Design a protein around this ligand. Structure first.
Ligand code: HAF
Length: 119
């Protein structure tokens, strides 16, 4: 529940489940802008505006290194991806439209992850 999301440390099973949320996100049609971090070669000024950059491969690495102790931390990193994108980009950007779609998809998958967890 909300009680678990905050209090319950991520169990090695939960870490299996988060790799599967993450893979389904890497598999979405509209995840392509976010699979890897923003090439500082190709967008030099981005890292001088975005304070907390994040991307899907960085998140997979933090999962592999069991870097998250609670699920709130995982959700917070994911949310950076979409918030940074909509902030940096004009709304007519294809990166923006992908953030809106894929965040909505992530919300669903997160409900699945929480419901499966309290069982
Ligand atoms: C690793 N790179 C990272 C890229 N991801 C990304 N790049 C930029 C922004 C962003 O928010 N993201 C998420 C903001 N941006 C930008 O300033 O665009 C303005 C319109 C000027 C506002 C540059 C996509 C790139 C790529 C490109 C084509 C096909 C596949 C991958 C793969």
């Amino acid at each position: 529940e909300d009680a678990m999301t905050v209090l319950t440390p991520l169990t090695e099973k939960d870490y299996e489940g988060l790799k599967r949320v993450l893979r389904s996100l890497q598999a979405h049609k509209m995840a392509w802008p976010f699979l890897e971090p923003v090439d500082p070669n190709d967008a030099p000024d981005y890292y001088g505006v975005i304070k907390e950059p994040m991307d899907l491969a960085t998140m997979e690495e933090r999962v592999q290194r069991r870097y998250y102790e609670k699920l709130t931390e995982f959700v917070a990193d994911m949310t950076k991806i979409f918030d940074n994108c909509r902030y940096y980009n004009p709304s007519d950007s294809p990166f923006y439209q992908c953030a809106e779609v894929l965040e909505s998809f992530f919300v669903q998958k997160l409900k699945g992850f929480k419901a499966s967890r309290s069982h």
